[PDB]
Symmetry: D2
Subunit: 399 residues, 4 copies
């Protein structure tokens, strides 16, 4: 049971959770706990050496880790979205080889991919086609995810050479240790302080032909067609939503334990014990209930993702669309719930809980930070567009 | 397929939904539509002539009807909760006898049972013991459910006699047409106008010995022990929540249809198509998303109810407690979502949509009425008590 | 003391508030109460025979009436907005003559004015120029305000003549009793049921030159220039906002009195006294607080309207602009508080409060109806545009 | 004009707000700015050399400061609660003596006062009576306000000696530099980091007879009787609330400027200007509107505070009660508005705005910390008890 193993790591990590949040930098030791656990091959078929877990199970693992550490939740979760990219646009040969290498070596995969808010011809990383059918990467990807400690890096570049291939997105999986690749210790933010989300430099970085995932612009073409490559956004977004849900659970549990041990009753109102306060009880109710709704929706979307995933290349543009609509709603549900609980929980904790040795603001800071990755407003709009007009979201990296 | 049948009834009923809400009284013709559909025996075991459907399916049928007509959803829905009472405290012979006649005769079951907020010694219907092992009923049950058109009536009376049975709640299933039983044409409310929830008078109504369900005070004892009789509340409460969700879908679908065909864009804002307004789109998103979360939680709870139901008498106080805690949360989720959607949908419908010929306020009026059956605040409180203090709710008729 | 006069009317109207809502039609007797009270000349200057009240006092009067009856609040409030149109675009002579006639004859003013959701050549009322400098009106104004019982009617027509004046909006003040004018007994809605907001047909209705208010397109010119005529919207929107607040107070008071005397405590939760239930108490707090913020903002906006009104024609587009932004916020605050309180009040009232004899849903239905006159989403947007970009609302009939 | 002084300080302090927040510790240079500004004697009567400012003006001064820096806002605001304490329970000679020196020396006043959530014999600071009519203080006050840098310290001690004075709270104002007084450099919290709110040790600290403010137990007596001394809670709570409103404005302004200058439009949605995003516009609208209502309510409470303050001893317990109810609602509004805006502002700011060099989370951390001083839940409950039952708050240090 990967979920039990994940909880084991959580047990270990909580003892250093405050300090690690305070220190920032890379979670080198915890990255190693995860590597050693075997959990990095969670979604690799058993037959290539992995766990062969299904999407609902994998998502439970993300949630468990995220409750202990928002940054480790994001790191591991974003790791899981990477390999499937091999499947969604790569060949059967790349897929077995790379999946096998990932399971065999317990590889961390990282991400230096989409520039979600830039016209492709403005992307900082250029891909120059070479005679042997490969490409050369140049530039800096400024916001990466888990590139720093990774073994295998999933990179996107745009052909900006004024050939007719101009504007083509090139997808590749290359060793992070390839010459010319520098994942920088670059990252600073109020939250998610240990996700290593700084920049990565590429300086005459060679991509071998067999390291290119599918044809040029394979992703953009799959997006337009809503073929299997278009499962990228629903997968990544559902993971993000469950990271937030784990963080909300983490907040709710830390709060509940503090209320049980350290909180004082408000004696001017005649309350005898902090756990008996009628408004404290109500608040925990509402936190639980909001999460109940959000988690049930997350689980439903995960089972829907499994069903669609099981169709392989036989998924329809309606499948992808219905799935993306559902995941967009989970993203919204998770965002709002996690934000509201992360902050609201202080009310039942009380003044002495603001001491930094509790680090109770880390949950909020962690969600407040990543929830800005892409605007929740257009996640809501996409749902409304579908409800009202039956229109599906425009396939892209985040919708 | 009972849902197919119910959806068939839904289309037919929708054409007169506005007038019926405005007229009130009994939906005599639609009740007969239900009788004729064969659907009244939905939850009756296959071996006695019923459909032998499981709880999740029965709930989908309820949701289908509730979306077309809130009163009929509740009426039918509450009907389904009555018979199982036989199973929960009645005997093996009572099940075989009553289930067979319910299914074979296509009987409406009605309800004149608990007075949920009155001390038992204050209940208006007394059961005075008779020598032959029966009872005679006297008094008026001021709030009933479906008694009026029913064939079989489930009644509670309290022994306030002086006998050794004194203070005990007696449950019985007797024919509604028995002498002394007068279900009054009594019901008035801003909403749920066709649910026939008026008073029923009892004047020397004799209950035969084999019509008595379980020992004297069986429900109360089952509650203390959390034995099978204590599933009453989780069942009815889950039924209610899904009525509210059905009503929310009816409101949301009605709005969508009107916005698409009848709504005008706000041209002072330069909007050219009502369906392309960014705030209209956002609002439809928010409605869907709140329902998405509430529906998913309701459905999980339906499966947990099935699980617990299938355990028969081997259910534990732990099984019952966890279930009620989950249903309590669904009741809250559904209450809030149906209220917000029922009311909010007006924002995107527009001024001309307030005309009575649309009856667009019926959804809100239906949810607003029944959501007061028992206070959502203590549904919320019960969840908080479990989350914070690990307490399960005290078993009773509404918790 | 006009507020004292208003409380006197409220006390008179109180016993039959339920009855009036159920009957719909015209509040013929109560419209007469208002006429006899002298309050219709509240905003007419003392020098012309009126009370010469300031805007804050006039708005206090509106709130009293609205608290007693949403429809009468609306009728009286909209009446107050019509008269100033004489001042804002009429000549000094029309001003002295009409103000004097309104005050001396105690005239009801009515409205068959803007078609807020149509470009002018799509307006249903045509204004055809006559040699003598007058106009003839033809067509139907489908949404009117107080036209049915009025003495003086403010009408808008569009020159659709292929005249040189074509496309011009003509504003006029004519007797409702002029031949060819037919205010229909046409109005039906779930709420605001006695506001006589039906259609008015115009059949070759003559408007004399001295009945024309300002130049052709006077409103549009004054708006574009943000001259004094452009105060219509802030005046009208501030009145609307205070009607809603008045209705919110009405619901809150009705609820409280019911809770104090008739609400039952929830005994399964062990509550002995309903007025001591902790969640009931919290809910009344939240109702009061929402109202506390919204009322204080409204009052501040009233004094700002006064300051601006007193600048006469020396007001700048900045004065008008800042004022409208302030009123836009009050409109949003009032809309939301009145909707939330109108409905939420049921939670603390209980099941028996759904009986039609209490008509407790009249408050919500009234606000729910009129809050759709113009979209609150764009009141909110106008505020946001100003906060972020310093942009002022585009002047029109609702902004 | 003290407000012009406050605005001058605030402009300067905004510039170093980010670093000072990250550094924590004491704001020594800024505390010295305040002293030099003359602003510390704001509430000292003109006849003793102070500003003699009225409450609305003093409260505006707190807001100005808080918008720039929440910590300085709390420090200065709490300082201001100390001064009136001389008036409300001291003698006329103490008034002349203490007020003169504060104004002349520009003294910081600090606080080792009430234990708002502790029973009197449980207070850590005991007051042992001395022969000369003075007291000796022993123990450590764990939560102080501005004690560390103060010149004059207001201390409460409880008689726990088994004299006839047992249980009496003794109030005194002593020089902070008195032997035996040790303010520890103790303060740490996620927010309000520069408010110097740590512990202060008292070790056989002598209180001279003329240093005692009023009779033994003067405060508790004043509370029970609702005499003038009982204005402490409404004054402190209104000050607190305006700190939150100040912080909320600070958050809002910081966001608006960032959005205008640094925010990226979301190009997948076809947005060309970030300031033209309809949902970005809506959010700023909503932020503005929440603040609009709360500010107006706050300003209203300050004038009511003036009215009651100006009544001197002729204030009634009803005067006190009504004001405290009004202030409670302001406290609730400000808490909620500041929390929602401090956090929500990140949505329209975007990902790069999470960099620590912007310190944009400092607004939330500051409000989130101090909003826990006393539970807003009971501010809400106090309002509801008044609305429903006409009950007033139990006079104390926070109500």
């Amino acid at each position: 049971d990967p979920v039990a193993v994940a909880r084991g790591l959580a047990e270990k990590w909580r003892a250093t959770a405050v300090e690690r949040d305070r220190a920032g930098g890379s979670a080198t030791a915890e990255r190693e706990d995860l590597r050693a656990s075997g959990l990095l091959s969670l979604l690799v078929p058993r037959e290539y050496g992995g766990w062969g877990a299904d999407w609902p199970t994998a998502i439970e693992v993300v949630r468990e880790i995220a409750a202990a550490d928002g940054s480790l939740g994001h790191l591991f979760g974003y790791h899981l979205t990477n390999a499937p990219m091999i499947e969604l646009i790569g060949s059967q040969e790349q897929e077995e080889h790379l999946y096998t290498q990932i399971a065999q070596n317990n590889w961390w995969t990282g991400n230096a991919s989409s520039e979600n808010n830039s016209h492709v011809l403005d992307w900082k990383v250029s891909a120059t086609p070479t005679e042997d059918g490969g490409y050369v990467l140049n530039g800096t990807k400024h916001f990466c995810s888990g590139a720093k400690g990774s073994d295998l890096l999933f990179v996107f570049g745009v052909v900006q050479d004024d050939s007719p291939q101009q504007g083509a997105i090139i997808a590749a999986a290359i060793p992070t240790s390839r010459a010319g690749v520098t994942p920088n210790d670059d990252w600073a933010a109020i939250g998610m302080r240990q996700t290593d989300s700084g920049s990565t430099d590429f300086h005459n970085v060679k991509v071998e032909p067999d390291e290119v995932l599918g044809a040029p612009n394979a992703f953009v073409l799959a997006f337009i067609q809503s073929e299997r490559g278009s499962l990228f956004a629903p997968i990544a977004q559902l993971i993000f939503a469950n990271v937030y849900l784990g963080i909300a659970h983490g907040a709710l549990d830390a709060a509940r334990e503090y209320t049980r041990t350290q909180a004082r009753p408000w004696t001017p109102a005649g309350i005898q014990q902090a756990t008996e306060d009628p408004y404290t009880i109500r608040s925990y109710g509402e936190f639980t209930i909001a999460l109940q709704g959000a988690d049930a929706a997350a689980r439903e979307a995960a089972h829907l993702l499994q069903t669609v995933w099981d169709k392989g290349d036989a998924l329809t543009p309606e499948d992808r669309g219905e799935l993306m609509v559902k995941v967009s709603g989970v993203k919204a549900l998770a965002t709002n719930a996690a934000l509201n609980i992360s902050s609201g929980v202080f009310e039942v904790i009380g003044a002495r809980g603001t001491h930094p040795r509790y680090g109770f603001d880390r949950f909020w800071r962690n969600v407040r930070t990543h929830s800005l990755h892409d605007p929740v407003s257009y996640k809501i709009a996409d749902v409304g567009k579908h409800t009202l007009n039956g229109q599906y979201p425009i396939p892209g990296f985040t919708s």
